[PDB]
Design a protein around this ligand. Structure first.
Ligand code: NAG
Length: 507
């Protein structure tokens, strides 16, 4: 047999350039039969759970769906608590879910008279709703009313569940600041592709972005800049709670990161007492990494960390806090081991499990409940994690979405090489680490060179679609030629959402 890899498309990107569902990520099964369902102005969404509490949760999910459908159709679809759906209805139920599909799995069966989504849990109804939106015609994704499109769904049968439990996106809001609205938008867009985790990189050398009432100068001084100089910004604790709540409506866990002991210049610029000479560091607006450190043998360091963790824990319902641990090149190995162990004890005392970048798993203070975020993806990375029974989240080069698509990309870094839409697809988590308990995947969007929402869109779309499928779709069912053609077909949907995507010439 004959095989080949993909080159660039002759005459340019199909994303330029180019009854038809566009499901991404690819579901476990999808078959189409004869006939179609028509969504009309009289349609209702019916919801029914196994008890009144569950029905109430489904009702909220139904309302979220109704809102989305209403925006593009111009209809006023309402939600009804009843297990007796009427012809032309969408029906969302957890009664009799297939347990093998797990918390996030679902069946979605469309007949001529009815759309029925059957899941084990409300979470699965939410995920299945993302597929339902992709079964309706392009135009359904519009935020304004679309005329001249019949709102049809082919008679079809879908079953689905994720391959990995953790399918995340990290946004760096330290290097450049993004508004609550901008953050909510990225969470919303990601949710449509079954991303279920959002990691906020809230602090680094160039800025500190979370209000800490016990150390107010973290904001008064530490938030006032960013890469390239200029105003910066921050989130109040109320704003952070608002982000968490918004994510929760999409069944997205928010994991906040306070990077330590490295990547700490903004803290060091805020409080002189965190420095050996007792003086504040000057703020840094460059893009160098690795140079900064907390004082690993000063008790004030651990008091500071405890105050930050106490306040963050109080406002962050996730059982996880990310404490960073990358590129502590001004911290000795001995001090790093000691420091990371001490801060893990603090986090645990406030009821939080610790996530950390490699090599944080090597800390003698880690527990089997700690999580390794494996970004290095070398043969030796996560040796400690594996021996300790720690879950691993992988973030290989293929998941570093801040990398340029190509040598000539106008934004992005390139220290992990270039990552086009194909590279973002053609990998497997088991490539990064062998013999581990792989919790899942996280796409990291560092922001050294991204200033505007358009920059975020350009780099995340279509790259994040590739990573999302790697997290959701089983390896045996992943195929670039398949995904590429599906992505071409999906393009109008990106346009309709107002995503300022890159029309990748390999698509
Ligand atoms: C864990 C990690 O990635 N650390 C740094 C991060 O601060 C930087 O923004 C990113 C840019 O790609 O490169 C990394 O080396």
């Amino acid at each position: 047999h004959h095989h080949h890899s993909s080159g660039l498309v002759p005459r340019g990107s199909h994303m330029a350039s180019m009854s038809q569902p566009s499901i991404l990520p690819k579901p476990v099964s999808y078959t189409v039969g004869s006939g179609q369902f028509v969504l009309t102005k009289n349609a209702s969404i019916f919801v029914a759970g196994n008890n009144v509490g569950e029905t109430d949760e489904l009702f909220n999910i139904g309302q979220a769906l109704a809102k989305k459908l209403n925006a593009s159709t111009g209809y006023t679809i309402s939600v009804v608590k009843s297990n007796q759906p009427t012809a032309g209805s969408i029906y969302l139920t957890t009664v009799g879910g297939n347990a093998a599909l797990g918390n996030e799995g679902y069946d979605l069966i469309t007949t001529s008279n009815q759309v029925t989504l059957t899941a084990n849990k409300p979470e699965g109804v939410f995920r299945g709703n993302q597929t339902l939106l992709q079964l309706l015609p392009a135009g359904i994704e519009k935020n304004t009313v679309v005329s001249g499109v019949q709102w049809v769904i082919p008679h079809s049968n879908i079953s689905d569940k994720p391959e990995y439990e953790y399918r995340g996106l990290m946004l760096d809001v330290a290097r450049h600041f993004f508004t609550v609205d901008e953050v909510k938008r990225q969470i919303d867009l990601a949710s449509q592709y079954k991303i279920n985790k959002f990691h906020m990189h809230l602090s680094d050398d160039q800025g500190w972005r979370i209000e800490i009432k016990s150390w107010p100068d973290l904001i008064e001084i530490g938030s006032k800049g960013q890469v390239g100089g200029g105003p910066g910004g921050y989130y109040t604790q109320e704003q952070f709670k608002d982000i968490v709540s918004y994510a929760a409506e999409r069944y997205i866990e928010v994991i906040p990161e306070i990077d330590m002991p490295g990547h700490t210049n903004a803290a060091l610029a805020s409080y002189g007492e965190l420095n050996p000479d007792g003086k504040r560091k000057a703020m840094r607006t460059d893009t160098a990494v690795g140079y900064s450190t907390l004082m690993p043998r000063a008790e004030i360091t651990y008091q500071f960390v405890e105050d930050v963790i106490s306040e963050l824990a109080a406002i962050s319902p996730s059982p996880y806090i990310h404490l960073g641990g990358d590129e502590s090149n001004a911290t000795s190995a001995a001090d790093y081991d000691y420091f990371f162990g001490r801060v893990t004890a603090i986090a645990n005392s406030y009821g939080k499990k610790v996530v950390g970048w490699d090599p944080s798993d090597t800390s003698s203070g880690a527990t089997s409940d700690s999580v390794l975020q494996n970004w290095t993806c070398s043969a030796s990375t996560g040796t400690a994690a594996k021996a300790k029974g720690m879950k691993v989240i992988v973030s290989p080069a293929n998941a570093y979405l801040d990398m340029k698509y190509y040598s000539d990309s106008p934004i992005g870094l390139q220290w992990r090489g270039f990552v086009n839409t194909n590279r973002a697809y053609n990998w497997d988590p088991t490539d990064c680490i062998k013999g581990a308990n792989i919790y899942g995947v996280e796409s990291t969007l560092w922001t050294e060179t991204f200033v505007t929402q358009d920059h975020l869109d350009y780099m995340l779309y279509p790259k994040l679609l590739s990573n999302a499928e790697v997290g959701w779709t089983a390896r045996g069912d992943r195929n670039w030629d398949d995904f590429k053609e599906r992505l071409i077909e999906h393009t109008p949907r990106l346009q309709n959402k107002g995503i300022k995507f890159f029309a990748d010439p390999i698509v």
